[PDB]
RNA sequence: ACCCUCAGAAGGGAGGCGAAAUAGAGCAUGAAAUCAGUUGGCGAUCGAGCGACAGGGCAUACAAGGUCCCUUGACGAAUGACCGAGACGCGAGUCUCCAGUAAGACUCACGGGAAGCCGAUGUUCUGUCGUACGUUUUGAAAAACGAGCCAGGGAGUGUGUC
RNA sequence: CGCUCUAAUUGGAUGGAAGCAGGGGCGAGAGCUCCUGUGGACCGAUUAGUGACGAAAAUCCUGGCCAUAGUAGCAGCGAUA
């Protein structure tokens, strides 16, 4: 379905938390943001420990529940929510005006935000969001 | 007792009241609530269907433990309070009777206002175990009715 | 055909530059409600002020948000304290002989509630003739 | 009283008396807790000392309050620039001049505007702060003690001596 | 600051007192005061007195009232009617 975005961000080879922090800041300023190519988004560090943290979040829960997303679609969306006061009116409106996508459903190419890009030629210790999702058990639909 | 809580123009209106009725007040709120807006004749047919058990009265406020009824629309709980329905029929017999005497078409008149008020309790006492006694009271109900021309 | 008030209703006093400055200050600054602690929490506890005596009382200890405690620092300016919002000093009147000595430029008059329609009519006409405004006038059909 | 209704000396309706029946029989007045109906505000995706202070929505017969908004201008405490020019710094940036200038809370004046309009009141939304009250206690939101709610009642008094 | 009754001085009320309900104004505040409705006969102020004079609390007292709830009971017994 259509979503009229003011800003379209390209998450490809970009440090997740840094994109997320900027997308949150913009959503609270009234912008309708759309994060694109989230499967190709990046997160630094040793893969074994990163996956361990995300696997623990999946195993955590009870009857009240702890719904933790396995797909890179929802993982990026949850990362943004943690940077937004989603329980408050202004915060929920900001969050609901942000959507994360697998690939690029638009004709326009996304913009790469400043300070978010990771130089692959300078880094080897990082993981792609899709690689985390495959290890978590999600169905590769990208 | 009570007095009519709503203004009424005598030229286009018929009135009626019930005094110190020993019936359930909780049932009376539910019946009043449901018959309001209906025509006097529609209300008589409705209350007769309740006594027969063919039409349930929605219990929206006093419903703790009340089982669900399929015929209740927009709500779930309901019952068939015959005692208070028979008393409301006496109120509608009086109202339509007062109406016809004034030259109106009683049955066809709209129920503009209908409300039940708890006027008191007929005190009672029930012996319990351990040499103690507790209350066993009967509610005393008043109910006003204002019929109006369509 | 319509209702009209007796006397000089639209009359305003002549105050010095300083007394008008202080009157405008009292009106701007205002003061807090000064209602008793937790009056809103319990019906048996009225709005009337009582000093919070409790050793652990949040209001007594001056916790922010628990309401202002009565202090002398809250007093209105001496030069304007007790004046009617118009700027007039009030004089309570019971009869016609109570209007004597009243300066209609500085003071306005307030007829006591008990005083009946007969005596009120005589007080009102004698007040208008003496150039004194009646704060609580009779509204006659003119 | 009369009439209608009703199983009816009930009750109800209409009617009569009286200044007043909302003075109609435990019948002067008629508070609160609280109940029925109803009005305003909120409301079935959202968080809990229930508020105080700020600021917005919606709501308001009169009376007892009459203020309030916007251009501009005057005054102008502490504070206090942009731009530009000159000069330093690896750099972020800084010093000098412009300048204690423009600005600067309050208050006032001219012109224009508002009367649900300003205040105020009801409710609700946003911001800030906020785990009752009283008592016990070194330490009470306390998993320490008391209260279901309201009204009324409820605790330094007398004599003698010093 | 407020309450009771006494006194002196001095006022208000059937052209509507006290009380009560809702509302306006003042006082840092105790509280004062006005408007409207109700009520239908009493009510103040100042000064000097008087005191069975002020409540949110005491598992406080008495009365009234809500939720609990249209819920438990109206079955169980060698007499199942
Ligand atoms: Cl779970
Ligand atoms: Cl939040
Ligand atoms: Cl690396
Ligand atoms: Cl009941
Ligand atoms: Cl003082
Ligand atoms: Cl000023
Ligand atoms: Cl003492
Ligand atoms: Mg049941
Ligand atoms: Mg016994
Ligand atoms: Mg209260
Ligand atoms: Mg009475
Ligand atoms: Mg201890
Ligand atoms: Mg005197
Ligand atoms: Mg008392
Ligand atoms: Mg105490
Ligand atoms: Mg008791
Ligand atoms: Mg139960
Ligand atoms: Mg048998
Ligand atoms: Na990490
Ligand atoms: Na989980
Ligand atoms: Na149904
Ligand atoms: Na249905
Ligand atoms: Na408001
Ligand atoms: Na204690
Ligand atoms: Na405590
Ligand atoms: Na505790
Ligand atoms: Na009880
Ligand atoms: Sr940012
Ligand atoms: Sr219920
Ligand atoms: Sr009066
Ligand atoms: Sr009558
Ligand atoms: Sr929380
Ligand atoms: Sr200056
Ligand atoms: Sr009432
Ligand atoms: Sr006492
Ligand atoms: Sr009960
Ligand atoms: Sr049996």
XYZ file of C-alpha atoms (C1' of nucleotides) and ligand atoms in Angstrom:
714
model
C 0.000 0.000 0.000
C 0.977 3.648 -0.614
C 2.787 5.741 1.978
C 3.622 9.336 0.996
C 7.109 9.741 2.449
C 8.879 13.108 2.690
C 12.246 11.399 3.223
C 13.307 7.992 1.838
C 16.430 6.605 3.547
C 18.743 3.952 2.048
C 19.871 1.666 4.863
C 22.264 -0.271 2.585
C 25.721 -0.529 4.214
C 24.655 1.952 6.900
C 25.077 1.660 10.678
C 21.548 0.862 11.944
C 21.509 2.759 15.256
C 22.882 5.908 13.615
C 20.202 5.866 10.905
C 17.580 5.060 13.568
C 18.621 8.009 15.759
C 18.280 10.416 12.819
C 14.979 8.896 11.622
C 13.577 9.332 15.155
C 14.751 12.964 15.379
C 13.090 13.681 12.013
C 9.813 11.902 12.841
C 9.414 14.093 15.932
C 10.022 17.150 13.713
C 7.024 16.047 11.665
C 8.701 14.155 8.803
C 7.186 11.054 7.192
C 10.205 8.749 6.885
C 10.608 5.480 4.978
C 13.650 3.300 5.654
C 14.476 1.217 2.601
C 16.712 -1.862 1.986
C 16.651 -2.834 5.670
C 17.797 -6.376 4.878
C 21.060 -4.776 3.768
C 21.395 -2.562 6.872
C 24.526 -2.975 8.961
C 25.445 -3.465 12.634
C 29.101 -3.482 13.833
C 30.972 -5.932 16.040
C 31.588 -9.662 16.455
C 28.730 -11.645 14.809
C 28.697 -14.342 17.501
C 27.940 -11.869 20.323
C 25.455 -9.820 18.259
C 23.418 -12.921 17.379
C 23.639 -14.031 21.058
C 21.944 -10.784 22.171
C 19.210 -11.018 19.520
C 18.673 -14.743 20.251
C 18.214 -13.986 23.954
C 15.556 -11.358 23.072
C 13.686 -14.034 21.132
C 13.893 -16.555 24.004
C 12.757 -13.984 26.588
C 9.050 -13.899 27.370
C 6.117 -15.147 29.433
C 2.294 -15.001 29.386
C 2.252 -11.187 29.302
C 4.629 -11.564 26.369
C 7.705 -9.985 24.841
C 7.059 -9.831 21.083
C 10.521 -9.576 19.535
C 10.728 -9.402 15.700
C 12.897 -11.869 13.796
C 12.676 -10.221 10.341
C 14.914 -7.179 9.485
C 11.675 -5.376 8.684
C 10.581 -5.358 12.301
C 14.058 -5.296 13.931
C 14.777 -1.863 12.418
C 11.258 -0.726 13.324
C 11.828 -1.776 16.957
C 15.239 -0.026 17.047
C 13.461 3.210 16.004
C 10.723 2.696 18.656
C 13.375 2.550 21.383
C 14.470 6.039 20.367
C 10.884 7.342 20.450
C 8.485 7.982 23.370
C 5.914 5.671 21.650
C 3.577 5.532 24.682
C 2.939 9.301 24.522
C 0.620 10.887 21.916
C 3.349 12.886 20.092
C 5.671 9.870 20.183
C 3.110 7.418 18.785
C 2.269 9.836 15.939
C 5.994 10.120 15.124
C 6.411 6.323 15.152
C 3.329 5.677 13.014
C 4.644 8.070 10.380
C 7.802 5.923 9.997
C 7.776 2.627 8.039
C 10.598 0.186 7.287
C 10.783 -1.799 4.034
C 12.448 -4.921 2.604
C 14.089 -3.774 -0.625
C 12.741 -0.626 -2.306
C 8.989 -0.447 -3.195
C 9.480 3.094 -4.565
C 10.773 4.337 -7.937
C 13.038 6.863 -6.191
C 16.402 5.791 -4.791
C 16.897 6.533 -1.117
C 19.298 9.093 0.293
C 22.283 8.005 2.385
C 22.314 10.108 5.581
C 25.567 11.676 6.841
C 27.781 9.728 9.230
C 25.749 6.541 8.813
C 27.678 4.790 6.001
C 30.189 2.042 6.732
C 33.221 1.586 4.465
C 33.407 -2.172 3.734
C 37.038 -1.775 2.626
C 37.887 -0.575 6.138
C 35.686 -3.012 8.120
C 35.324 -6.799 8.384
C 33.704 -7.160 11.840
C 30.021 -6.406 11.136
C 26.783 -8.180 10.159
C 24.030 -7.560 7.648
C 20.534 -7.386 9.197
C 19.370 -10.178 6.887
C 22.129 -12.463 8.185
C 20.850 -11.957 11.750
C 17.297 -12.780 10.620
C 18.321 -16.012 8.870
C 20.106 -17.158 12.043
C 17.018 -16.199 14.095
C 14.899 -18.480 11.917
C 13.026 -16.030 9.677
C 11.948 -17.048 6.169
C 14.226 -15.336 3.605
C 11.688 -13.413 1.554
C 14.174 -10.860 0.159
C -42.578 9.846 47.192
C -41.557 11.455 43.912
C -42.927 14.222 41.669
C -42.542 14.446 37.867
C -38.899 15.259 37.166
C -39.645 16.508 33.640
C -41.928 19.382 32.503
C -45.115 18.364 30.713
C -47.531 20.381 28.544
C -51.089 19.158 29.499
C -52.539 19.823 26.011
C -50.251 17.280 24.276
C -49.446 15.005 27.241
C -50.779 12.223 29.505
C -49.234 11.289 32.898
C -49.130 8.263 35.256
C -47.395 7.037 38.427
C -46.764 3.912 40.529
C -46.267 4.267 44.297
C -44.305 2.218 46.890
C -44.252 -0.900 44.695
C -42.610 -3.909 46.326
C -40.681 -5.085 43.280
C -37.044 -5.162 42.186
C -35.648 -1.690 41.523
C -32.817 -3.116 39.436
C -35.386 -4.740 37.142
C -37.358 -1.494 36.984
C -34.375 0.558 35.731
C -33.816 -2.035 32.984
C -37.465 -2.108 31.884
C -37.821 1.692 31.878
C -34.586 2.054 29.870
C -35.808 -0.395 27.228
C -39.442 0.803 26.820
C -38.554 4.527 26.471
C -39.126 5.936 22.987
C -41.582 3.154 22.159
C -45.279 3.699 21.555
C -47.567 2.794 24.511
C -49.020 -0.096 22.496
C -45.558 -1.296 21.412
C -44.507 -1.262 25.076
C -47.541 -3.345 26.086
C -46.789 -5.943 23.366
C -43.122 -5.921 24.434
C -43.807 -6.430 28.154
C -46.325 -9.198 27.444
C -43.665 -10.991 25.378
C -41.277 -10.667 28.357
C -43.813 -12.265 30.747
C -44.214 -15.026 28.156
C -40.440 -15.426 27.910
C -40.249 -14.641 24.192
C -38.415 -11.316 24.595
C -35.532 -10.566 26.997
C -34.940 -7.294 28.847
C -31.274 -6.170 28.488
C -29.520 -6.007 31.871
C -26.773 -3.456 31.197
C -26.114 -2.165 34.694
C -27.255 -4.936 37.064
C -25.844 -7.936 35.260
C -23.458 -9.760 37.614
C -23.788 -13.453 36.907
C -26.563 -13.010 34.325
C -26.401 -15.443 31.415
C -26.270 -14.236 27.831
C -29.406 -14.102 25.662
C -29.268 -14.387 21.839
C -32.194 -12.001 21.244
C -30.409 -9.116 23.042
C -29.106 -6.682 20.414
C -25.868 -4.730 20.906
C -25.523 -6.270 24.356
C -25.210 -9.729 25.949
C -26.931 -10.158 29.335
C -30.677 -10.166 29.769
C -33.569 -11.681 31.732
C -37.388 -11.927 31.837
C -38.559 -9.951 34.925
C -42.289 -10.700 35.013
C -43.223 -9.097 38.379
C -41.879 -5.657 37.503
C -43.177 -6.050 33.909
C -46.693 -6.781 35.181
C -46.416 -3.623 37.325
C -45.293 -1.586 34.324
C -48.342 -2.915 32.450
C -50.520 -1.477 35.246
C -48.722 1.829 34.702
C -49.357 1.671 30.945
C -53.023 0.647 31.493
C -53.455 3.753 33.679
C -51.559 6.065 31.305
C -53.485 4.956 28.183
C -56.701 5.137 30.225
C -56.009 8.734 31.332
C -55.117 9.535 27.727
C -58.341 8.205 26.210
C -60.363 10.113 28.828
C -58.632 13.328 27.723
C -59.502 12.574 24.087
C -56.117 11.263 22.877
C -55.253 8.076 20.974
C -53.582 6.448 23.999
C -51.968 3.385 22.387
C -50.353 5.423 19.593
C -48.681 7.873 22.016
C -44.886 7.953 22.484
C -43.267 7.326 25.894
C -41.517 10.701 26.357
C -40.330 9.909 29.848
C -40.197 6.832 32.101
C -38.000 6.482 35.168
C -37.908 4.366 38.306
C -36.912 5.719 41.722
C -36.125 3.825 44.952
C -38.358 5.443 47.574
C -37.361 3.157 50.434
C -37.202 -0.349 51.848
C -39.751 -2.414 53.731
C -37.493 -3.536 56.576
C -37.144 -7.218 57.298
C -34.942 -9.414 59.456
C -33.664 -12.968 58.877
C -32.279 -15.162 61.700
C -28.784 -16.427 60.933
C -26.410 -18.864 62.627
C -24.476 -18.028 65.861
C -27.392 -16.152 67.517
C -27.252 -13.223 65.084
C -29.775 -11.667 62.644
C -29.259 -9.768 59.372
C -31.384 -7.659 56.992
C -33.980 -9.179 54.652
C -35.526 -6.105 53.014
C -37.951 -5.412 50.120
C -37.336 -2.391 47.818
C -40.146 0.191 47.544
C -40.327 1.633 44.007
C -42.023 4.644 42.417
C -42.160 5.057 38.651
C -43.207 8.043 36.565
C -44.507 7.988 33.000
C -45.182 10.818 30.573
C -46.923 9.965 27.280
C -46.765 12.436 24.378
C -48.505 12.941 21.013
C -46.504 11.714 17.937
C -39.040 47.076 27.219
C -35.500 46.162 28.398
C -33.648 45.759 31.728
C -31.402 48.595 32.908
C -29.406 49.130 36.106
C -30.053 52.052 38.467
C -27.254 54.517 39.187
C -23.799 55.264 37.803
C -22.775 51.706 36.784
C -20.099 52.779 34.259
C -18.286 55.023 36.790
C -14.511 54.506 37.201
C -12.380 56.000 40.048
C -9.481 58.421 39.591
C -6.392 56.650 40.863
C -2.828 57.944 40.923
C -0.270 56.516 38.466
C 1.188 54.330 41.231
C -2.144 52.952 42.479
C -3.146 51.995 38.917
C 0.248 50.319 38.377
C -0.191 48.273 41.539
C -3.820 47.374 40.700
C -2.726 46.104 37.285
C 0.044 44.100 39.031
C -2.359 42.415 41.483
C -4.546 41.468 38.512
C -1.619 40.089 36.459
C 0.233 38.202 39.205
C -2.818 36.833 41.018
C -2.257 34.131 43.642
C -2.671 30.358 43.976
C -5.973 28.811 45.160
C -4.655 28.102 48.674
C -7.087 25.240 49.243
C -6.376 22.594 51.907
C -4.139 19.608 51.099
C -5.988 16.631 49.629
C -9.400 18.346 49.751
C -10.012 16.867 46.298
C -9.238 13.343 47.523
C -11.846 13.168 50.269
C -15.366 14.664 50.398
C -15.263 15.099 54.207
C -12.240 17.383 53.802
C -13.379 20.866 52.760
C -11.584 23.427 50.637
C -10.921 25.870 53.548
C -7.227 26.401 54.394
C -5.517 24.534 57.209
C -1.762 24.499 57.779
C -0.385 21.034 56.773
C 0.712 19.747 60.204
C 1.834 16.224 59.306
C 5.493 15.434 59.965
C 5.716 13.645 56.631
C 3.298 15.922 54.718
C 4.475 16.520 51.172
C 2.982 20.040 51.112
C 4.509 20.920 54.522
C 7.912 19.812 53.263
C 7.381 21.969 50.179
C 7.569 19.242 47.518
C 7.029 20.748 44.051
C 3.541 20.033 42.751
C 1.839 19.633 46.108
C 0.653 23.233 46.239
C 1.919 26.484 47.747
C 1.795 26.918 51.518
C 0.454 30.212 53.005
C 3.262 32.745 53.566
C 3.469 36.532 54.023
C 5.428 36.821 50.754
C 2.137 36.215 48.924
C 0.454 39.428 50.129
C -0.937 41.987 47.673
C 0.506 45.604 47.598
C -0.567 47.751 50.607
C -1.636 50.630 48.332
C -4.186 48.452 46.591
C -5.069 45.587 49.000
C -8.808 45.055 49.315
C -9.841 47.194 46.328
C -12.652 46.135 43.999
C -11.442 45.084 40.495
C -12.605 48.547 39.291
C -10.158 50.267 41.629
C -12.794 51.528 44.040
C -12.537 51.166 47.819
C -15.713 49.519 49.159
C -18.072 51.013 51.723
C -20.794 48.733 53.098
C -24.123 50.579 53.386
C -27.226 49.664 55.433
C -29.318 52.865 55.303
C -29.405 56.376 53.764
C -27.395 57.893 56.662
C -24.504 55.524 55.840
C -23.900 57.320 52.501
C -22.683 60.425 54.363
C -18.947 61.076 54.198
C -18.553 58.753 51.195
C -16.404 60.213 48.401
C -17.838 59.009 45.078
C -14.450 59.531 43.365
C -12.486 57.203 45.656
C -15.232 55.008 47.124
C -18.145 53.015 45.694
C -21.042 51.586 47.680
C -22.337 48.060 48.371
C -25.804 47.713 49.894
C -26.082 44.907 52.471
C -28.060 41.812 51.345
C -30.679 42.074 54.139
C -31.861 45.564 53.088
C -35.259 45.361 51.367
C -36.576 46.812 48.087
C -38.160 49.813 49.863
C -34.994 51.013 51.613
C -32.835 50.029 48.573
C -34.795 52.385 46.275
C -34.176 55.310 48.640
C -30.449 54.450 49.010
C -29.947 54.060 45.247
C -31.465 57.429 44.214
C -29.630 59.340 46.967
C -26.370 57.664 45.914
C -26.781 58.690 42.250
C -27.467 62.287 43.348
C -24.298 62.266 45.493
C -22.216 60.908 42.599
C -21.643 57.467 44.184
C -21.785 54.172 42.266
C -23.757 51.248 43.725
C -21.871 48.002 43.041
C -25.027 45.871 43.416
C -27.796 47.847 41.596
C -31.487 47.091 41.045
C -32.367 46.224 37.455
C -35.653 47.926 36.545
C -37.678 47.509 33.332
C -37.279 50.717 31.263
C -66.685 17.023 46.699
C -67.481 15.294 41.659
C -65.678 12.325 37.365
C -62.343 8.701 34.855
C -59.220 4.262 35.914
C -58.488 -0.091 38.913
C -59.773 -6.449 41.822
C -59.790 -1.755 44.829
C -61.855 3.074 51.273
C -55.162 1.187 47.410
C -52.654 3.822 43.979
C -52.998 6.829 39.516
C -55.291 10.763 36.350
C -58.374 15.170 36.200
C -60.334 18.391 39.696
C -61.327 21.391 44.469
C -59.097 24.334 49.057
C -55.154 27.739 50.516
C -50.498 33.002 50.026
C -48.233 28.293 49.647
C -49.855 21.225 48.703
C -42.351 21.119 46.128
C -47.587 23.019 53.420
C -51.552 16.584 51.803
C -50.836 13.761 57.231
C -43.529 11.321 61.016
C -47.074 17.035 56.298
C -41.704 24.246 58.562
C -36.859 24.358 56.409
C -34.967 20.050 53.666
C -27.469 19.799 53.699
C -24.083 15.603 52.616
C -23.358 10.467 51.526
C -26.316 8.463 47.667
C -30.271 6.852 43.543
C -33.300 7.628 38.903
C -33.554 10.570 34.593
C -30.997 14.128 31.961
C -27.042 18.307 30.217
C -22.038 19.608 29.280
C -16.908 17.548 28.673
C -14.008 12.802 27.911
C -14.732 7.830 25.945
C -14.173 0.740 23.697
C -5.048 1.424 21.372
C -4.495 2.385 26.209
C -1.431 3.391 32.660
C -2.539 4.211 38.342
C -2.116 9.742 45.033
C -6.719 11.354 41.455
C -3.490 17.157 41.848
C -0.481 22.114 41.886
C 1.401 25.623 38.474
C 1.630 26.925 32.658
C -0.658 26.632 28.291
C -4.433 24.733 24.528
C -9.974 22.241 22.803
C -14.972 22.199 23.703
C -19.110 24.216 27.028
C -21.606 29.110 29.349
C -29.095 33.695 29.677
C -29.189 37.777 33.259
C -27.165 39.252 38.059
C -23.228 39.961 41.525
C -16.315 40.481 37.739
C -14.751 43.743 32.839
C -11.445 43.023 30.694
C -8.686 40.844 26.394
C -6.047 40.441 21.276
C -3.135 42.604 17.105
C 0.117 46.957 13.838
C 2.829 50.760 15.418
C 5.063 54.112 18.999
C 7.121 55.640 24.099
C 9.795 53.778 28.302
C 13.622 50.140 28.622
C 16.824 46.475 34.606
C 20.170 42.483 34.359
C 21.573 40.510 29.885
C 22.960 41.265 24.958
C 23.875 40.071 19.281
C 23.607 38.850 13.611
C 26.014 40.928 9.268
C 30.346 43.329 7.929
C 35.862 44.946 8.530
C 40.661 43.829 10.603
C 43.675 40.245 13.026
C 44.981 35.139 15.268
C 44.204 29.451 15.334
C 46.370 22.616 12.614
C 41.090 22.738 13.808
C 36.329 23.215 16.142
C 36.569 28.252 16.860
C 38.514 33.039 18.858
C 40.104 38.476 19.672
C 39.438 43.805 18.031
C 35.647 47.310 15.843
C 30.724 47.713 14.750
C 28.264 48.315 20.380
C 26.674 48.197 25.989
C 24.266 49.377 19.899
C 19.732 46.449 17.626
C 17.355 43.663 21.122
C 15.388 43.363 26.261
C 10.255 41.719 31.149
C 6.617 45.185 32.889
C 3.807 49.675 32.031
C 1.550 53.311 29.034
C -0.345 56.115 24.298
C -2.590 56.365 19.074
C -5.043 53.228 15.500
C -7.682 48.682 14.658
C -10.387 44.229 16.703
C -13.079 40.522 20.161
C -18.477 40.166 24.039
C -18.323 32.904 24.883
C -15.292 38.009 24.042
C -11.325 38.578 28.740
C -11.781 36.875 33.727
C -14.290 33.073 35.970
C -16.644 28.245 36.130
C -17.249 22.657 34.155
C -14.557 19.058 31.501
C -10.648 17.443 28.738
C -5.691 17.614 26.257
C -0.211 19.078 26.493
C 4.279 20.543 29.550
C 6.781 20.521 34.490
C 6.744 18.303 39.419
C 4.358 14.466 41.920
C 4.296 6.694 45.139
C -2.300 10.145 50.067
C -3.499 11.784 54.906
C -2.542 11.342 60.230
C 0.405 8.196 63.579
C 4.551 5.184 65.049
C 9.720 5.518 63.574
C 16.838 6.518 62.959
C 14.233 5.618 58.304
C 6.665 5.326 55.951
C 4.212 4.958 49.244
C 5.295 1.145 52.485
C 4.423 -5.830 52.621
C 4.184 -0.916 60.082
C -0.894 1.026 62.477
C -6.270 3.673 61.518
C -10.531 4.657 58.309
C -16.209 1.818 53.451
C -18.816 6.891 52.476
C -21.504 11.351 54.540
C -23.758 14.265 58.386
C -23.983 15.327 63.479
C -21.415 14.126 68.131
C -16.134 13.839 70.158
C -10.431 15.821 74.206
C -6.411 21.782 79.124
C -12.055 21.947 83.272
C -13.152 23.402 88.785
C -11.664 24.404 93.773
C -7.694 25.153 97.156
C -2.431 26.437 97.842
C 2.170 28.087 95.785
C -10.191 34.717 61.918
C -14.844 32.032 63.319
C -18.942 30.078 67.124
C -22.633 30.843 71.799
C -25.107 33.911 75.075
C -24.740 38.916 78.228
C -24.235 44.240 78.108
C -23.683 49.281 76.132
C -23.843 51.996 71.479
C -26.013 51.373 66.864
C -28.398 49.103 62.470
C -31.318 45.427 58.925
C -36.233 42.406 57.925
C -42.954 40.204 55.047
C -40.958 46.068 49.511
C -38.826 39.067 52.425
C -34.661 37.598 58.186
C -31.824 32.882 59.277
C -30.772 28.512 56.712
C -29.805 25.878 52.110
C -28.280 25.396 46.427
C -25.766 27.467 42.417
C -22.886 31.636 41.039
C -19.844 36.854 41.339
C -15.928 39.988 44.394
C -12.203 40.632 48.412
C -8.383 38.788 52.025
C -1.402 35.437 52.182
C -5.059 33.100 55.198
C -8.522 31.761 59.228
C -12.617 34.027 56.762
C -15.661 38.402 54.888
C -19.210 39.881 51.273
C -22.573 40.282 47.035
C -26.097 37.976 43.024
C -29.868 34.431 41.660
C -33.225 30.539 43.302
C -35.469 28.366 47.609
C -37.312 29.714 52.316
C -41.119 32.537 55.294
C -39.380 34.749 60.470
C -36.194 36.349 62.484
C -30.850 38.786 61.859
C -26.627 41.767 62.605
C -22.259 45.504 63.439
C -18.740 47.997 66.978
C -17.031 47.825 71.882
C -16.537 45.203 76.679
C -17.599 40.399 78.430
C -19.001 34.999 78.602
C -17.608 29.973 77.367
C -20.440 22.663 77.239
C -16.148 27.731 71.119
C -13.519 25.339 65.748
C -12.217 17.864 63.692
C -10.113 13.980 58.658
C -8.325 10.683 61.954
C -9.028 7.966 68.154
C -10.321 -0.981 65.483
C -13.675 6.952 68.105
C -19.957 7.404 69.088
C -25.005 7.684 66.799
C -27.744 7.964 62.405
C -28.128 7.551 57.407
C -26.213 5.552 52.738
C -23.347 3.036 48.354
C -20.459 -0.968 46.288
C -20.649 -5.883 47.518
C -25.573 -8.208 44.470
C -30.165 -9.397 41.894
C -25.002 -12.527 44.506
C -25.028 -16.699 49.084
C -29.487 -19.297 51.305
C -34.759 -20.902 50.089
C -30.900 -28.853 47.668
C -27.985 -32.314 51.251
C -31.268 -35.122 57.185
C -33.456 -43.102 55.375
C -39.732 -38.504 55.740
C -36.727 -37.404 47.750
C -44.185 -36.283 46.565
Cl 6.560 -14.269 24.788
Cl 6.886 6.868 26.261
Cl 37.021 -4.849 11.188
Cl -31.841 -2.085 44.901
Cl 0.767 40.673 57.274
Cl 4.444 47.702 36.234
Cl -3.855 23.635 76.714
Mg -24.751 -16.942 37.102
Mg -29.205 -19.101 69.630
Mg -13.758 17.483 49.462
Mg -41.471 18.831 54.987
Mg 12.534 0.290 64.111
Mg -20.873 50.872 69.074
Mg -18.548 20.041 65.258
Mg -5.503 15.666 63.446
Mg -21.214 2.238 62.386
Mg -19.653 -12.670 42.961
Mg -40.542 -41.049 46.549
Na 26.245 -4.783 18.529
Na 10.492 -12.826 22.429
Na -26.440 -10.842 20.659
Na -28.744 -10.192 18.562
Na -9.563 24.905 29.910
Na 0.361 4.815 65.364
Na 1.960 7.914 56.173
Na 7.098 -1.754 51.978
Na -20.660 -2.377 55.925
Sr 20.267 13.610 14.837
Sr -22.204 -4.140 36.624
Sr -31.215 38.670 50.426
Sr -53.976 17.752 41.237
Sr 5.532 2.542 34.751
Sr 19.448 50.761 27.110
Sr -31.361 18.564 45.217
Sr -16.027 20.840 72.095
Sr -27.652 -2.823 50.334
Sr -37.528 -30.266 47.802
